[PDB]
Design an enzyme around this catalytic site. Structure first.
Site, PDB file in Angstrom:
ATOM      1  N   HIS A  38       0.579  -1.065   0.448  1.00  0.00           N
ATOM      2  CA  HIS A  38       0.074  -0.031  -0.229  1.00  0.00           C
ATOM      3  C   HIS A  38       1.113   1.033  -0.552  1.00  0.00           C
ATOM      4  CE1 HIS A  38      -3.944   2.354   0.915  1.00  0.00           C
ATOM      5  NE2 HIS A  38      -3.166   2.828   2.196  1.00  0.00           N
ATOM      6  N   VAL A  63       0.352   1.110  13.571  1.00  0.00           N
ATOM      7  CA  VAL A  63       0.580  -0.465  13.843  1.00  0.00           C
ATOM      8  C   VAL A  63       0.615  -1.080  14.779  1.00  0.00           C
ATOM      9  CG1 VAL A  63       2.889  -1.665  13.563  1.00  0.00           C
ATOM     10  CG2 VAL A  63       2.197   0.052  11.984  1.00  0.00           C
ATOM     11  N   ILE A  70      -3.986  -1.464  14.375  1.00  0.00           N
ATOM     12  CA  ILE A  70      -4.681  -2.302  13.770  1.00  0.00           C
ATOM     13  C   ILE A  70      -3.749  -3.645  13.289  1.00  0.00           C
ATOM     14  CG2 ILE A  70      -5.260  -2.286  11.309  1.00  0.00           C
ATOM     15  CD1 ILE A  70      -4.823   0.689  11.587  1.00  0.00           C
ATOM     16  N   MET A  95      -2.108  -4.083   9.544  1.00  0.00           N
ATOM     17  CA  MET A  95      -1.227  -3.062   9.534  1.00  0.00           C
ATOM     18  C   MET A  95       0.307  -3.726  10.355  1.00  0.00           C
ATOM     19  SD  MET A  95      -1.366   0.941  10.639  1.00  0.00           S
ATOM     20  CE  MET A  95      -0.710   2.242   9.242  1.00  0.00           C
ATOM     21  N   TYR A 101      -7.803  -2.583   7.165  1.00  0.00           N
ATOM     22  CA  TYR A 101      -7.502  -1.316   7.945  1.00  0.00           C
ATOM     23  C   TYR A 101      -8.217  -0.333   7.332  1.00  0.00           C
ATOM     24  CZ  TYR A 101      -3.856   2.971   6.304  1.00  0.00           C
ATOM     25  OH  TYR A 101      -3.313   3.396   6.352  1.00  0.00           O
ATOM     26  N   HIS A 161     -10.602   0.157   9.604  1.00  0.00           N
ATOM     27  CA  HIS A 161     -10.802  -0.289  11.155  1.00  0.00           C
ATOM     28  C   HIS A 161     -10.538   1.718  11.844  1.00  0.00           C
ATOM     29  CE1 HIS A 161      -8.783  -0.665  14.773  1.00  0.00           C
ATOM     30  NE2 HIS A 161      -8.630  -1.648  14.865  1.00  0.00           N
TER      31      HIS A 161
HETATM   32  C1  LIG Z   1       1.267   9.166   6.787  1.00  0.00           C
HETATM   33  C2  LIG Z   1       0.838   8.995   5.839  1.00  0.00           C
HETATM   34  C3  LIG Z   1      -0.979   9.065   6.284  1.00  0.00           C
HETATM   35  C4  LIG Z   1      -2.058   8.388   4.701  1.00  0.00           C
HETATM   36  C5  LIG Z   1      -3.465   8.739   5.327  1.00  0.00           C
HETATM   37  C6  LIG Z   1      -4.349   8.901   4.097  1.00  0.00           C
HETATM   38  C7  LIG Z   1      -5.577   7.999   4.568  1.00  0.00           C
HETATM   39  C8  LIG Z   1      -6.404   7.578   3.491  1.00  0.00           C
HETATM   40  C9  LIG Z   1      -7.424   8.056   2.621  1.00  0.00           C
HETATM   41  C10 LIG Z   1      -7.927   8.085   2.777  1.00  0.00           C
HETATM   42  O1  LIG Z   1      -9.300   9.494   1.943  1.00  0.00           O
HETATM   43  C11 LIG Z   1      -8.228   7.052   2.030  1.00  0.00           C
HETATM   44  C12 LIG Z   1      -7.199   6.295   2.066  1.00  0.00           C
HETATM   45  O2  LIG Z   1      -6.977   5.322   1.537  1.00  0.00           O
HETATM   46  C13 LIG Z   1      -6.020   6.362   3.031  1.00  0.00           C
HETATM   47  C14 LIG Z   1      -5.376   5.198   3.143  1.00  0.00           C
HETATM   48  O3  LIG Z   1      -5.139   4.216   2.214  1.00  0.00           O
HETATM   49  O4  LIG Z   1      -4.641   5.103   4.573  1.00  0.00           O
END
Ligand SMILES: CCCCCCCc1cc(O)cc(O)c1C(=O)O
Ligand SMILES: CCCCCCCc1cc(O)cc(O)c1C(=O)O
Lengths: 104, 104
Positions: free
Chosen positions: A8, A34, A37, A40, A75, A78
């Site tokens: 990912h 981590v 979840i 993760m 994830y 969650h």
């Molecule tokens: C340290 C970088 C933190 C990233 C946060 C992204 C959270 C998020 C928001 C979203 O609208 C869609 C998603 O897939 C994800 C994700 O994958 O974590």
């Protein structure tokens, strides 16, 4: 080994008003997921140093390995991830997400 | 660890009319640059499977390992890299390029 895991990949640009200290706290809180979840497993991240993308100025790259797309989806939904995403959504200006199995 | 590395990450969208056969040859010719360009140490790549930014259209993620930003520059200016763009720039619609050192 012979395993077929899924990476990912998150590519992010923060809003201009976000300070460096705030970005660091955002990443630290993310890495803490981590411990919460099950799906993760690990987080690696880095800051881009070459700035080659002009109007698409993403700065941060985050890599998280998972056992499958289905556990990536675990994830996503969650509550600790939902909560993190919702309360920090205003931090980022651009976000791209990719899920792939690296191969040669 | 003792070794230092910088990851050169490419995110890529092919033009819509490009065939799968053409993509495969394009990628094979790119990964063959490891046999041509000294600085280029390894390539892993994959195709996105979740389509979480389908509207932007990037599909392929390519991770290239280098020893340093200086050897990345040697790769960029190598004639075979210039020549890859000469022959294949018309196949891609858009790209993002990043250079970063993953860390925890
Ligand atoms: C340290 C970088 C933190 C990233 C946060 C992204 C959270 C998020 C928001 C979203 O609208 C869609 C998603 O897939 C994800 C994700 O994958 O974590
Ligand atoms: C299978 C991956 C094919 C990648 C080709 C991208 C070549 C390229 C074009 C450019 O306009 C700027 C760059 O930095 C690079 C590069 O980094 O190789």
């Amino acid at each position: 080994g012979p395993g077929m895991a899924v990476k990912h990949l998150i590519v992010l640009k923060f809003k201009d008003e976000i300070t460096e200290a705030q970005k660091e706290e955002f990443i630290k809180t993310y890495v803490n997921l981590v411990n919460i979840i099950p799906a993760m497993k690990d987080v690696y991240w880095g800051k881009d140093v070459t700035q080659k993308n002009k109007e698409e100025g993403y700065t941060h790259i985050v890599e998280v390995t998972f056992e499958s797309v289905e556990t990536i989806q675990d994830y996503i939904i969650h509550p600790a991830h939902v909560g993190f995403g919702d309360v920090y959504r205003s931090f980022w200006e651009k976000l791209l997400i990719f899920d792939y199995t690296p191969r040669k």
